[PDB]
Amino acid sequence: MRHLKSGRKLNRHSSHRLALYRNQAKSLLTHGRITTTVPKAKELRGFVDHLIHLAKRGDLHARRLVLRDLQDVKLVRKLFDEIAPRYRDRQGGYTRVLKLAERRRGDGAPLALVELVE
Amino acid sequence: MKGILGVKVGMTRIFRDDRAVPVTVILAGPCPVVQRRTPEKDGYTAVQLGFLPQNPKRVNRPLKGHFAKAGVEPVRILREIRDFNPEGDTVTVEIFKPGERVDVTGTSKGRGFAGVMKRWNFAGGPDSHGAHKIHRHPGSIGNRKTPGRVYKGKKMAGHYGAERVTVMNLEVVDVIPEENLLLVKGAVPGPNGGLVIVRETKKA
Amino acid sequence: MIQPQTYLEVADNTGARKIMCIRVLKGSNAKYATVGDVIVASVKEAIPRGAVKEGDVVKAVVVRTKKEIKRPDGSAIRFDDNAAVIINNQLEPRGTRVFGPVARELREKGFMKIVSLAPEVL
Amino acid sequence: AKHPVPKKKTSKARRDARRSHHALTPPTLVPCPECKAMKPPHTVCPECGYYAGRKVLEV
Amino acid sequence: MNRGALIKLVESRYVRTDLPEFRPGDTVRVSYKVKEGNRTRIQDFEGIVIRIRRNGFNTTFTVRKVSYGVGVERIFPLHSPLIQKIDIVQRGRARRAKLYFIRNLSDREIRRKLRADRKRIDQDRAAERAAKEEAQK
RNA sequence: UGGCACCUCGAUGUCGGCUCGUCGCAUCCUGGGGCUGAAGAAGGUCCCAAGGGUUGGGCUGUUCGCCCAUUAAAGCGGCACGCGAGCUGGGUUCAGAACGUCGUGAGACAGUUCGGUCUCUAUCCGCCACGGGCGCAGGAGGCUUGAGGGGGGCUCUUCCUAGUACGAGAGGACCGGAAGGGACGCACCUCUGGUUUCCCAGCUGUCCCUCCAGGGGCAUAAGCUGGGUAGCCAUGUGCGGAAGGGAUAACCGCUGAAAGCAUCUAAGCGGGAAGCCCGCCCCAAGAUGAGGCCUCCCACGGCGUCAAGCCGGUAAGGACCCGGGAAGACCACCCGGUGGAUGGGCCGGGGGUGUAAGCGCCGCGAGGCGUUGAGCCGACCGGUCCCAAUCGUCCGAGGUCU
RNA sequence: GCGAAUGCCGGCAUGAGUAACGAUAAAGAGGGUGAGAAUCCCUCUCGCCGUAAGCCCAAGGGUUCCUACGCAAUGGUCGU
RNA sequence: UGAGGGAAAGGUGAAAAGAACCCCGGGAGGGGAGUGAAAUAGAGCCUGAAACCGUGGGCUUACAAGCAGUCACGGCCCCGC
Ligand SMILES: [Mg+2]
Ligand SMILES: [Mg+2]
Ligand SMILES: [Mg+2]
Ligand SMILES: [Mg+2]
Ligand SMILES: [Mg+2]
Ligand SMILES: [Mg+2]
Ligand SMILES: [Mg+2]
Ligand SMILES: [Mg+2]
Ligand SMILES: [Mg+2]
Ligand SMILES: [Mg+2]
Ligand SMILES: [Mg+2]
Ligand SMILES: [Mg+2]
Ligand SMILES: [Mg+2]
Ligand SMILES: [Mg+2]
Ligand SMILES: [Mg+2]
Ligand SMILES: [Mg+2]
Ligand SMILES: [Mg+2]
Ligand SMILES: [Mg+2]
Ligand SMILES: [Mg+2]
Ligand SMILES: [Mg+2]
Ligand SMILES: [Mg+2]
Ligand SMILES: [Mg+2]
Ligand SMILES: [Mg+2]
Ligand SMILES: [Mg+2]
Ligand SMILES: [Mg+2]
Ligand SMILES: [Mg+2]
Ligand SMILES: [Mg+2]
Ligand SMILES: [Mg+2]
Ligand SMILES: [Mg+2]
Ligand SMILES: [Mg+2]
Ligand SMILES: [Mg+2]
Ligand SMILES: [Mg+2]
Ligand SMILES: [Mg+2]
Ligand SMILES: [Mg+2]
Ligand SMILES: [Mg+2]
Ligand SMILES: [Mg+2]
Ligand SMILES: [Mg+2]
Ligand SMILES: [Mg+2]
Ligand SMILES: [Mg+2]
Ligand SMILES: [Mg+2]
Ligand SMILES: [Mg+2]
Ligand SMILES: [Mg+2]
Ligand SMILES: [Mg+2]
Ligand SMILES: [Mg+2]
Ligand SMILES: [Mg+2]
Ligand SMILES: [Mg+2]
Ligand SMILES: [Mg+2]
Ligand SMILES: [Mg+2]
Ligand SMILES: [Mg+2]
Ligand SMILES: [Mg+2]
Ligand SMILES: [Mg+2]
Ligand SMILES: [Mg+2]
Ligand SMILES: [Mg+2]
Ligand SMILES: [Mg+2]
Ligand SMILES: [Mg+2]
Ligand SMILES: [Mg+2]
Ligand SMILES: [Mg+2]
Ligand SMILES: [Mg+2]
Ligand SMILES: [Mg+2]
Ligand SMILES: [Mg+2]
Ligand SMILES: [Mg+2]
Ligand SMILES: [Mg+2]
Ligand SMILES: [Mg+2]
Ligand SMILES: [Mg+2]
Ligand SMILES: [Mg+2]
Ligand SMILES: [Mg+2]
Ligand SMILES: [Mg+2]
Ligand SMILES: [Mg+2]
Ligand SMILES: [Mg+2]
Ligand SMILES: [Mg+2]
Ligand SMILES: [Mg+2]
Ligand SMILES: [Mg+2]
Ligand SMILES: [Mg+2]
Ligand SMILES: [Mg+2]
Ligand SMILES: [Mg+2]
Ligand SMILES: [Mg+2]
Ligand SMILES: [Mg+2]
Ligand SMILES: [Mg+2]
Ligand SMILES: [Mg+2]
Ligand SMILES: [Mg+2]
Ligand SMILES: [Mg+2]
Ligand SMILES: [Mg+2]
Ligand SMILES: [Mg+2]
């Protein structure tokens, strides 16, 4: 009855949810900004902020913990070598979520526009 | 009839001389009184308390604007505690004494649209032995032609919980004076954060 | 916490080894049975040369359960297997050597000759 | 044909009364702080684009 | 500060935090006891402790022992007034902190899976406290 | 069990069981009382009393009935022999087949046995819950009395009085007190035990990242095993029934004529039950009989069929939108919206998991040691404005009459 | 000469914006075409079959094959 | 499979004189303009009913219970000197 469970259940199962966050992490870290639905985004921010806080260390083990959920070495070296320096003067919350209008025609779902903070 | 506004903060065990007591720590702090009733004005003669502090900008002022007593308006429901009579400033915990039986009236947890087996403790059909779809159903709800209609209160599914629930005859274990806390003996209605009123139990 | 159709293991030397209890003596509908509780058991298997044969309907007291005994100080205790001692109709054990450990609630619930007979009372 | 069936048909005073609740509400339309068009709150003005920051792409 | 461990720290002003920390190894535990009116006869109880469910003030642990062919295990609150809790042989090697698998196999192969430690023996004998500084001068 | 054949042959599903109840008393117990062939206990019978209970099993398809262990009791009935738009199909009322009997035979048997399709969508009334509109004769924010309605309305054992009264003795109370239980109901997760779906660790096979190492996917919609915090529960914990008042039924009376005596009654006054109403708790002013109290705002800003009942903004307020919540199907309720800790991230604490990767040493190697209670963290509790509630928009009385 | 025949034929209702939308193998993201894209084309990830959910024939079906132009109708939604 | 069973589907206008052209709209669909006696005579288009679905006006309904009707009193609205 989830009297305290956060969850964010998304009409999928566990491996589809974790592999979905694996896919949106790669698609958000490849091009920066992203556009998706709202409840997938409002929990995906808690995953990408976890990856960037595990990118602030950079000590050969947190690299492996980034590689547990980001299987592209070229994307991880781009993450550490192009994203990790310019966020070091910011403490937490490295991702902004701004809701987008003009909902989809076939679905009627509200849109979310989620990008890296400048 | 002594009473206080309180709020659940959690429960634990205390240790007496031989037996442990499943206490509930409960924060019944300094409660400002705002209004007294009168037999010559309303008759039932209760006293209106309010307890937890509010910054004066979320108010809307039919509420902001009570007179001299408790100019700083509280947050929660201004509960009248049914013929209790303080001196006029506030009601502390030292009105209560350890070893007295105190009533706790709060607001229990609503389970949502709770089922009939979880709600009214039925038995239902078996899992095996050919049972089509009866595994959690209540079953029969009446009779044929006479009487016809289903009687009122047939104890079916609905909103179980989220109502005002009174748990009675709780003995006071310990009093904390510096933070104005109470230690009742377990089974308080309400979640961590649910406001209660704590009266005197009768049980004469 | 033993129920109907339960195989209590006899911790006594009255001949019985494993018994099956049916009705608990507490009231109208005794659902469970704690430690220190008089039950009625039929004897399934016995050792020879004993006064308790197979199929006897005797009374007993429960001395060990796998379900815990909750001591009133907050503490608790569990055992390894269910055990009973063959009591009579006048609350006296028929055997003069009880096997293994027993509980402490037998003392405060009446029985002294059983607890004084048990070697290591827990 | 199976276990639930309508015994009698619903008339105009009952069909045209059960439809009375589910009607479309007018969507709230606050003015855009830069654009001279209407838009629902807490989302992007489709011509403004958040004071021309992360906007619908301009030249 | 309305809720949390500062309110739950007020009812922890009688805590007994001088008793030593212990991993799941062999130990002996004495306890107060009330029987026959008088509160005397503290009782010792050795064995291997299985589960360490530490939770704030009201922590719990369970000491199992083999007693006359019967596995008897015991649920202790660690803060009720038990006098001494001294560890006989600090075996340990708790690869699993919840070693519930022992209750199936009751035989000599307990200590081949629960081997004697060396580390806590080393800082135990190195932390033996026997430094005669009291009234030494 | 019958008799009748009055609606039902364009059909009203038949026995039994499970779940779910409700009602009557002609009461099985618990509560009172009279009589007794009532010495006491245990009894028998009758009157009042339906408030609450009426077990767990074996046998047969069984209702019933016979036995085991208990209890104070394992009551009798109705509600389409309650209940198949709830379920079961064991028997009977389908087609197969066989046994015994009858019949030349086909077949039949209120005789026996094996097997044998039980029909997803609620239109209206009813019921359980939650809402929208309007009303409550000015508009709102709260607090709250209670006309009325349901829940609970249990009950046993041990000890003192007391081995006293009584009885030759065996036996063994009434009155009152103390403690502990069996079932049911409410609340909680601190103790005990569960679940906890990717929180942690280990492991097998294959494939992939990059060869080693280290990782990822699949083997469930968890790949298996061991744990597992918060939350949700009971197997756990704390409570409940009352204590007390009034009128009472059966019954026991006081005074007292009719009927100079007598009499509980004809006037009156009493005692007298788990029964009734009080009392406890919630529901509750849609109790139009629409209650009561505190606080905020209020004449025109134009004119009728005149203080809006002809209209546009607006005061108090409310609504839309967003963050959310042990609040929740949707709705609704509650806390916030830069004057903020409401959610996410981070930090600190609690807690789960158990010595992370890498380095150095030993060993041919699998593996073991120090770095290390380290590394990893879903919820529990605080702090931090780093990000998201930015901007905002729309309704809203203008104070009728005796 | 119609109101009945569980009459027939044609239209429109109730059921109702209700059930369902057809194996619980699984989708996500960035560009392009286009007035209009969760559904069309390309690219990067994830999953499924792989004694087939792969390939080759005979049955059977009869232009369903390819290209170009379009969405009147069909595709259990949209669809360029 | 086959023997066989077996439909519905007529109407513009005298003459297509079948709506050139402008605008919205992707198109469809129309709004104008024009032909036409008539364009609610617009291309399966003569007349075009009823069931059915709506829009606009008058009356009445949020304390009343009925196979929904009839009679009476009254109020409101619309015709008629
Ligand atoms: Mg949460
Ligand atoms: Mg779905
Ligand atoms: Mg809830
Ligand atoms: Mg069940
Ligand atoms: Mg099933
Ligand atoms: Mg079936
Ligand atoms: Mg009736
Ligand atoms: Mg209508
Ligand atoms: Mg702590
Ligand atoms: Mg009859
Ligand atoms: Mg006749
Ligand atoms: Mg019919
Ligand atoms: Mg029939
Ligand atoms: Mg029949
Ligand atoms: Mg009677
Ligand atoms: Mg009788
Ligand atoms: Mg009696
Ligand atoms: Mg007697
Ligand atoms: Mg009754
Ligand atoms: Mg009854
Ligand atoms: Mg039936
Ligand atoms: Mg049926
Ligand atoms: Mg039925
Ligand atoms: Mg059958
Ligand atoms: Mg069958
Ligand atoms: Mg046959
Ligand atoms: Mg279905
Ligand atoms: Mg309904
Ligand atoms: Mg309402
Ligand atoms: Mg109220
Ligand atoms: Mg009332
Ligand atoms: Mg009423
Ligand atoms: Mg009542
Ligand atoms: Mg727990
Ligand atoms: Mg748990
Ligand atoms: Mg794969
Ligand atoms: Mg595969
Ligand atoms: Mg899987
Ligand atoms: Mg799978
Ligand atoms: Mg007299
Ligand atoms: Mg009388
Ligand atoms: Mg009387
Ligand atoms: Mg009386
Ligand atoms: Mg926050
Ligand atoms: Mg810690
Ligand atoms: Mg720890
Ligand atoms: Mg740490
Ligand atoms: Mg963390
Ligand atoms: Mg932490
Ligand atoms: Mg999670
Ligand atoms: Mg948290
Ligand atoms: Mg928090
Ligand atoms: Mg702080
Ligand atoms: Mg006709
Ligand atoms: Mg019909
Ligand atoms: Mg027809
Ligand atoms: Mg709907
Ligand atoms: Mg539906
Ligand atoms: Mg429906
Ligand atoms: Mg559906
Ligand atoms: Mg699906
Ligand atoms: Mg896509
Ligand atoms: Mg796109
Ligand atoms: Mg584009
Ligand atoms: Mg897609
Ligand atoms: Mg061919
Ligand atoms: Mg074909
Ligand atoms: Mg073709
Ligand atoms: Mg083409
Ligand atoms: Mg198309
Ligand atoms: Mg289509
Ligand atoms: Mg096109
Ligand atoms: Mg002309
Ligand atoms: Mg025209
Ligand atoms: Mg025209
Ligand atoms: Mg037409
Ligand atoms: Mg046409
Ligand atoms: Mg003509
Ligand atoms: Mg026509
Ligand atoms: Mg209309
Ligand atoms: Mg009325
Ligand atoms: Mg009215
Ligand atoms: Mg009438």
From Swiss-Prot, chain B:
List where this protein forms a coiled coil. none
Report the Gene3D superfamilies cross-referenced here.
Answer: 3.30.160.810, Translation factors
One Pfam short name: Ribosomal_L3
Its Gene Ontology molecular function terms? rRNA binding; structural constituent of ribosome
Concerning PTM, the database record says: The mass differences between the observed and calculated masses are suggested to be due to methylation, which is known to occur in the E.coli and R.palustris orthologs.
Q: Which domain of life is it from?
A: Bacteria
Q: Name the Gene Ontology biological process terms.
A: translation
Q: What's in the keyword line of the UniProt record?
A: Methylation, Ribonucleoprotein, Ribosomal protein, RNA-binding, rRNA-binding
Q: SUPFAM superfamilies, from UniProt?
A: Translation proteins
Cellular-component GO terms for this entry: cytosolic large ribosomal subunit
Q: Which family does it belong to?
A: Belongs to the universal ribosomal protein uL3 family.
Q: What is the recorded function of this protein according to its Swiss-Prot or TrEMBL entry?
A: One of the primary rRNA binding proteins, it binds directly near the 3'-end of the 23S rRNA, where it nucleates assembly of the 50S subunit.
SUBUNIT field: Part of the 50S ribosomal subunit. Forms a cluster with proteins L14 and L19.
Specify the protein name: Large ribosomal subunit protein uL3
Swiss-Prot record, chain C:
SUPFAM superfamilies this protein is in?
Ribosomal protein L14
PROSITE patterns the record matches? RIBOSOMAL_L14
Tell me which domain of life the UniProt entry assigns to the organism this sequence originates from.
Answer: Bacteria
The UniProt entry's GO biological process terms, in alphabetical order, are: translation
Signal sequence span is none
Q: Which UniProt keywords apply?
A: Ribonucleoprotein, Ribosomal protein, RNA-binding, rRNA-binding
SMART domains for the chain: Ribosomal_L14 (SM01374)
Pfam families listed in its UniProt record: Ribosomal_L14 (PF00238)
Kindly list the GO molecular function terms attached to this UniProt entry.
Answer: large ribosomal subunit rRNA binding; structural constituent of ribosome
Annotated Gene Ontology cellular components are: cytosolic large ribosomal subunit
In its keyword annotation, does this UniProt entry include Ribonucleoprotein?
Answer: yes
Q: How does it assemble?
A: Part of the 50S ribosomal subunit. Contacts protein L19. Forms a bridge to the 30S subunit in the 70S ribosome, contacting the 16S rRNA.
In the record, the note on similarity to other proteins reads: Belongs to the universal ribosomal protein uL14 family.
Described function:
This protein binds directly to 23S ribosomal RNA.
- Its protein name is Large ribosomal subunit protein uL14
- To which species is this protein native? Thermus thermophilus (strain ATCC 27634 / DSM 579 / HB8)
UniProtKB/Swiss-Prot annotation, chain D:
Compositional bias segments (type: Basic residues): 1-22
Which biological process terms from the Gene Ontology are attached to this UniProt entry? translation
What ranges does the record give for the region Disordered, renumbered to this chain?
A: 1-29
Keyword Ribosomal protein, does the record have it?
yes
Tell me the superkingdom of the source.
Bacteria
Q: Which Pfam families match?
A: Ribosomal_L32p (PF01783)
| SUPFAM superfamilies, per database record | Zn-binding ribosomal proteins
Alphabetical keyword list: Ribonucleoprotein, Ribosomal protein
Q: Name one GO molecular function term.
A: structural constituent of ribosome
Any one Gene Ontology cellular component term annotated for this protein: large ribosomal subunit
What the entry lists under NCBIfam families is as follows: rpmF_bact (TIGR01031)
On assembly, the entry states: Part of the 50S ribosomal subunit.
Function in brief: Found on the solvent side of the large subunit.
The entry assigns this protein to a family as follows: Belongs to the bacterial ribosomal protein bL32 family.
Q: What is this protein called?
A: Large ribosomal subunit protein bL32
Source organism (scientific name): Thermus thermophilus (strain ATCC 27634 / DSM 579 / HB8)
Which gene name does the record give? rpmF
UniProtKB/Swiss-Prot annotation, chain E:
UniProt entry keywords in alphabetical sequence: Ribonucleoprotein, Ribosomal protein, RNA-binding, rRNA-binding
Span list, region Disordered? 116-137
Record Pfam families: Ribosomal_L19
Superkingdom, natural source: Bacteria
UniProt-listed Gene3D superfamilies: 2.30.30.790
Q: Where is the composition biased (Basic and acidic residues)?
A: 119-137
Any single Gene Ontology cellular-component annotation: cytosolic large ribosomal subunit
Q: Which GO terms describe its molecular function?
A: rRNA binding; structural constituent of ribosome
One of this protein's GO BP terms? Answer: translation
What family does this chain come from, according to its entry?
Belongs to the bacterial ribosomal protein bL19 family.
Question: What PANTHER family would the database entry show?
Answer: LARGE RIBOSOMAL SUBUNIT PROTEIN BL19M, RIBOSOMAL PROTEIN L19
Listed under subunit, the entry gives: Part of the 50S risobomal subunit. Contacts protein L14. Forms a bridge to the 30S subunit in the 70S ribosome, contacting the 16S rRNA.
Q: What does this protein do?
A: Contacts the 16S rRNA of the 30S subunit (part of bridge B6), connecting the 2 subunits.
**Database matches in NCBIfam families:** rplS_bact
Q: What is this protein called?
A: Large ribosomal subunit protein bL19
Origin organism lineage: Bacteria, Thermotogati, Deinococcota, Deinococci, Thermales
Q: Its encoding gene is what?
A: rplS
